[PDB]
């Protein structure tokens, strides 16, 4: 996972 | 995991 | 885990 | 874990 | 663990 | 930049 | 930059 | 920069 | 900089 | 700088 946010 | 956020 | 946030 | 935050 | 925060 | 490779 | 590699 | 590699 | 490598 | 390596 690459997650930029919430 | 790469996580930029909450 | 890389975590920038909360 | 790398954690910058809370 | 590397932790910069609380 | 997010770069997975060379 | 996030770089996983060379 | 986050760099995992050389 | 966070650098895991050489 | 956080550097794990040479």
From Swiss-Prot, chains A, B, C, D, E, F, G, H, I, J:
The glycosylation pattern (the amount of mono-, di- and non-glycosylated forms or glycoforms) seems to differ in normal and CJD prion. It is found in: Cell membrane; Golgi apparatus. It comes from the Eukaryota. Monomer and homodimer. Has a tendency to aggregate into amyloid fibrils containing a cross-beta spine, formed by a steric zipper of superposed beta-strands. Soluble oligomers may represent an intermediate stage on the path to fibril formation. Copper binding may promote oligomerization. Interacts with GRB2, APP, ERI3/PRNPIP and SYN1. Mislocalized cytosolically exposed PrP interacts with MGRN1; this interaction alters MGRN1 subcellular location and causes lysosomal enlargement. Interacts with KIAA1191. Interacts with ADGRG6. Belongs to the prion family. It is linked to PrP is found in high quantity in the brain of humans and animals infected with neurodegenerative diseases known as transmissible spongiform encephalopathies or prion diseases, like: Creutzfeldt-Jakob disease (CJD), fatal familial insomnia (FFI), Gerstmann-Straussler disease (GSD), Huntington disease-like type 1 (HDL1) and kuru in humans; scrapie in sheep and goat; bovine spongiform encephalopathy (BSE) in cattle; transmissible mink encephalopathy (TME); chronic wasting disease (CWD) of mule deer and elk; feline spongiform encephalopathy (FSE) in cats and exotic ungulate encephalopathy (EUE) in nyala and greater kudu. Creutzfeldt-Jakob disease: Occurs primarily as a sporadic disorder (1 per million), while 10-15% are familial. Accidental transmission of CJD to humans appears to be iatrogenic (contaminated human growth hormone (HGH), corneal transplantation, electroencephalographic electrode implantation, etc.). Epidemiologic studies have failed to implicate the ingestion of infected animal meat in the pathogenesis of CJD in human. This protein is produced by a bicistronic gene which also produces the alternative prion protein/AltPrP (AC F7VJQ1) from an overlapping reading frame. Its primary physiological function is unclear. May play a role in neuronal development and synaptic plasticity. May be required for neuronal myelin sheath maintenance. May promote myelin homeostasis through acting as an agonist for ADGRG6 receptor. May play a role in iron uptake and iron homeostasis. Soluble oligomers are toxic to cultured neuroblastoma cells and induce apoptosis (in vitro). Association with GPC1 (via its heparan sulfate chains) targets PRNP to lipid rafts. Also provides Cu(2+) or Zn(2+) for the ascorbate-mediated GPC1 deaminase degradation of its heparan sulfate side chains. The normal, monomeric form, PRPN(C), has a mainly alpha-helical structure. Misfolding of this form produces a disease-associated, protease-resistant form, PRPN (Sc), accompanied by a large increase of the beta-sheet content and formation of amyloid fibrils. These fibrils consist of a cross-beta spine, formed by a steric zipper of superposed beta-strands. Disease mutations may favor intermolecular contacts via short beta strands, and may thereby trigger oligomerization. Contains an N-terminal region composed of octamer repeats. At low copper concentrations, the sidechains of His residues from three or four repeats contribute to the binding of a single copper ion. Alternatively, a copper ion can be bound by interaction with the sidechain and backbone amide nitrogen of a single His residue. The observed copper binding stoichiometry suggests that two repeat regions cooperate to stabilize the binding of a single copper ion. At higher copper concentrations, each octamer can bind one copper ion by interactions with the His sidechain and Gly backbone atoms. This is Major prion protein. The gene is PRNP.
């Amino acid at each position: 996972i690459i997650h930029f946010g919430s």
